[PDB]
């Protein structure tokens, strides 16, 4: 009956009910426990969500820190991907991570991210803008994926044979491929946009 | 049928009053001055309401929904994102409302011109798609986070600084000074410069 069982069960519970239907009541039932006893481990539903975010990053965000003589591009690419994995790891995973601030045990890891990017050419400012851009892009991708995943079941089936040519092309494209390709292109796009600034390709 | 009515309008004001969590049948019915069965006739479920609220928000505040006479694809993507941003920021929990948006037939023509315009500028249809998507998802991601941390900060124990290290701290002050918008415009600019350079 420690903090770690509570969190493993919460994670199992998240998969079975999603975030809207996750409650301390249901978690206490899953555990065969009185609601009070659970309170000591999680005060309320947002503390719970913060803890679940933390577990997910900790289990599945394997490229949290830069690495080796890995380039800044490799890091940003590998960091985005790995983060996306964390957000996809559970039902409504992105929504759980949404609006979570890093704890102090995370502060150091954030520090050598910045330091790594500044040691490799970026101003602090641009390093922030770069990390910010990959992060918000990655989160928004997963957030919509997971949301449309849910919505499709709460809606009448789609009126597709009706769409004009290019939009219909797009739709068949999407159906064949899913979301990942879009994610990868947007990710490369960001990295490349920062390459061009850093490279002074378009200067005078 | 929503469009004939004031449900949307009132629901928006309510959304502001109480946020998306608080947008329940009981409170909407009340706000409107009508019992629940009449509201049910207007709207079967919350998703349906959110769909209509999203559209209504775009129709009020997303003014750069298509490319202008003479505009380059770079400027169109810039103005469209910025305009999208504004629409999402125009209401409480505004981005959450737009989450999982399914375009209706009424919107098909706008979407089609977007694609037609980008391909006319020499994107493949496929790469056009990725630029639109990247710009879209980034804009949405940015605002969702902006809005959530806006709410969550109030239920949260103020950044115990000094514990945090040198560059992190500098980054916190920077963000304290400048807010979200400069980071948003720089990120937008990257995406665009990314596609610009692949093009050639």
């Amino acid at each position: 009956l420690d903090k770690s069982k509570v969190i493993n069960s919460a994670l199992e519970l998240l998969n079975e009910v999603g975030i809207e239907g996750l409650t301390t009541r249901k978690l206490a039932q899953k555990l065969g426990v009185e609601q009070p006893t659970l309170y000591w481990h999680v005060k309320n539903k947002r503390a719970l969500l913060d803890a679940l975010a933390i577990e997910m990053l900790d289990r599945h965000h394997t490229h949290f820190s830069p690495l080796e003589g890995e380039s800044w591009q490799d890091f940003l690419r590998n960091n985005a991907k790995s983060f996306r994995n964390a957000l996809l790891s559970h039902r409504d995973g992105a929504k759980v991570h949404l609006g979570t601030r890093p704890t102090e045990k995370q502060y150091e890891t954030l520090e050598n991210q910045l330091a790594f990017l500044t040691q490799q050419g970026f101003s602090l400012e641009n390093a922030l803008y770069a990390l910010s851009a990959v992060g918000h892009f990655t989160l928004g991708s997963v957030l919509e994926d997971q949301e449309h995943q849910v919505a499709k079941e709460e809606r009448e089936t789609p009126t597709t044979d009706s769409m004009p040519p290019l939009l219909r092309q797009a739709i068949e494209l999407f159906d064949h491929q899913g979301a990942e390709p879009a994610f990868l292109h947007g990710l490369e796009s960001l990295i490349r946009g920062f390459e061009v600034q850093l490279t002074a390709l378009l200067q005078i | 049928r929503l469009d004939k009515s004031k449900v949307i309008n009132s629901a928006l004001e309510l959304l502001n009053e109480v946020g998306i969590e608080g947008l329940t049948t009981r409170k909407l019915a009340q706000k409107l001055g009508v019992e629940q069965p009449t509201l049910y006739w207007h709207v079967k479920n919350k998703r349906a309401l959110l769909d209509a609220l999203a559209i209504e928000m775009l129709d009020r505040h997303h003014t750069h929904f298509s490319p202008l006479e003479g505009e380059s694809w770079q400027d169109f993507l810039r103005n469209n994102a910025k305009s999208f941003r504004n629409a999402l920021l125009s209401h409480r929990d505004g981005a959450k409302v737009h989450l999982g948006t399914r375009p209706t037939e009424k919107q098909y023509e706008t979407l089609e011109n977007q694609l037609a315009f980008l391909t006319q500028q020499g994107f493949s249809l496929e790469n056009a798609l990725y630029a639109l998507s990247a710009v879209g998802h980034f804009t949405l991601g940015s605002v969702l986070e902006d809005q959530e941390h806006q709410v969550a900060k109030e239920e949260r124990e103020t950044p115990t600084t000094d514990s945090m290290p040198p560059l992190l701290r500098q980054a916190i002050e920077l963000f304290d000074h400048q807010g979200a918008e400069p980071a948003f415009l720089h990120g937008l600019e990257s995406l665009i410069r990314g596609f610009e350079v692949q093009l050639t």
Partner: peptide
């Protein structure tokens, strides 16, 4: 619009 690839996925 996000142009999300599941915007028109069908149920189940």
């Amino acid at each position: 619009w996000t142009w999300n690839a599941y915007a028109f996925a069908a149920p189940s």
